[PDB]
Design a binder for this molecule. Structure first.
Ligand SMILES: O=c1[nH]c(=O)n([C@@H]2C[C@H](O)[C@@H](COP(=O)(O)O)O2)cc1F
Ligand SMILES: O=c1[nH]c(=O)n([C@@H]2C[C@H](O)[C@@H](COP(=O)(O)O)O2)cc1F
Lengths: 316, 316
């Protein structure tokens, strides 16, 4: 089927998976060096073997595609993937206007204490983030993220570069450029970074008709993160192809360390009792063009027939 | 054999190779999205099917490994791979102390005129480069090259970062870091660049014993450049492993556009009538350690039994 690539990685790190101690502490099953290719003309690579949200994907891709580092857009898009992160600037609070949030996670795996306080405290944070321009200014704003790396590279000699777009206009004027890369790995920055970008670089290609993409993703969580990553960059492949007046071809996913967590083995195995179902279709709106201006319903994903969601633990 | 990977790419771009018009004008056969893996414990991946110089490789790797942008080291190492490049600052000469060198190449494919003048003019340039500190200062110095990208990242807020070494000390203190990457793709710089780095990024890995490397190489010339690239990064894999007190494992080569030139087809085919020969051995000196201090004979490549060199045209 179109997603069997990912079930071949799921089986491979289970089979040839080496244990390597990881950061987010369970211990993991690693591989190093892996490419996977998806023909985006046969379907949209959301996973039919498990329910992956096309909605939350969507809202975070648009956030990136605008230049936003701010939590408020995503918050008012019911999207919480980067939420726990505005909260780093909440928790270290010289403006601590209150209580136990001192280490939030970890014991938020532990039912009352850091657990459900932190959890009612998300609305406390997620309220001023969304309703208080001032708050939103300061604690809801993730400095370097995907968004400003792809769109506002803090240049050396006082300024900013928009790699995506600058690249989009080379995808429109000089097609066969071997030089259509957008990097998120800036040397200067990476010494001080809570998450340094797991999706380091990618590169566009157009070959007789088609917009292909390749991803260099270095730390890839096979259960929980790779499913999404295939879909947020097949999406981009489509978004950009449709700006440039191109047809689509393939999405190439290259991993550095692609790893299973020890506490997601039983589940990935659970997923692997299911057979795929025919992949989705992606129809974007034909009138809208500046991909920068796209909004939520300029992308529908039709025909998503998925097995239920399987539910993790965490990767922390 | 250990190099059959590269003969499988050589056959693949010949077979599935799509024509794509290229920059360096013949026209080319492209693929996009390709990984190749070499087990550096079975051998050193220099190509027995054709004579690839281990010597010139060597001298340019050391140049990189020090921090040098200057042409003079390589010049006094009989190494001319980056020579035609000091000569960009010769040819645009406000200090033109002389004659026809006005467009050097192209008609240097054409026998007297730009041809053998330019060619006697290399000693003219390659003399002051090597004997005239002042000259060497200015026209022999390739600003951003591999060397200062890997070792002296011109930081934003007035300074420099040494990604390689800073990474080497994380390969020594925190081994399982998924974060051991050195990039050569700096956004700021790439707008103005005659060659923007074809070997964009790479990443180190240590898995139960071994130093693995992966390369993200975007524009790869399968006949003329890939043979080398395998060997200059297997070398690095070894150089770094031997600083850190590790054994070696694999070198992963990922390509973006891996392309044949139209005028190298007959030759790559010529190479493919030959069968491999057992790969080399690489013995570095056991006393020297700071890989930064290594010199020419702290690396011998034993047992190189290669078929003759096959001889190109150019890729320009
Ligand atoms: O977009 C992402 N995709 C992904 O797969 N991870 C993984 C999950 C894992 O828990 C985290 C930590 O990796 P490292 O220790 O290399 O930072 O990287 C994180 C992201 F932000
Ligand atoms: O280290 C290198 N390796 C390599 O394979 N090339 C290729 C050869 C080709 O002629 C050149 C031009 O590519 P682009 O048009 O993408 O600059 O890239 C160039 C290097 F510098």
């Amino acid at each position: 089927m179109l997603e069997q690539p990912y079930l071949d990685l799921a089986k491979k790190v289970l089979d040839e998976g080496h244990f390597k101690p990881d950061r987010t502490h369970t211990g993991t099953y690693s591989i190093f060096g892996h490419q996977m290719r998806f023909d985006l003309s046969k379907g949209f690579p959301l996973l039919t073997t498990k329910k992956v949200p096309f909605g939350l994907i969507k809202s975070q891709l648009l956030w990136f595609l605008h230049g936003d580092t701010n939590i408020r857009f995503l918050l008012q898009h019911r999207n919480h993937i980067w939420d726990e992160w505005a909260f780093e600037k909440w928790v270290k609070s010289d403006e601590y206007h209150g209580p136990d949030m001192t280490d939030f996670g970890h014991r938020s795996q532990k039912a009352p204490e850091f657990a459900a306080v932190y959890h009612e405290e998300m609305a406390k944070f997620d309220d001023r983030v969304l309703h208080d321009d001032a708050f939103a200014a300061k604690y809801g704003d993730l400095g370097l993220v995907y968004g400003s790396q792809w769109r506002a590279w803090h240049t050396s000699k006082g300024d900013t570069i928009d790699q995506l777009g600058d690249v989009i206009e080379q995808i429109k004027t000089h097609p066969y450029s071997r030089r259509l890369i957008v990097s998120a790995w800036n040397p200067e920055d990476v010494p001080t970074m809570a998450l340094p970008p797991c999706h380091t670089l990618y590169q566009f290609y157009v070959n007789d008709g088609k917009l292909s993409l390749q991803l260099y993703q270095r730390s890839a969580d096979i259960f929980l993160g790779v499913p999404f990553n295939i879909a947020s960059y097949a999406l981009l492949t489509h978004l950009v192809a449709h700006e440039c007046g191109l047809e689509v071809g393939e999405f190439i996913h290259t991993f550095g360390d692609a790893h299973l967590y020890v506490n997601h083995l039983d589940q990935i195995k659970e997923q692997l009792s299911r057979t795929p179902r025919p992949a989705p279709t992606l129809q974007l709106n034909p009138d809208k063009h500046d991909i920068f201006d796209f909004d939520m319903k300029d992308i529908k994903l039709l025909n998503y027939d998925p097995y239920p969601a399987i539910k993790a633990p965490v990767a922390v």
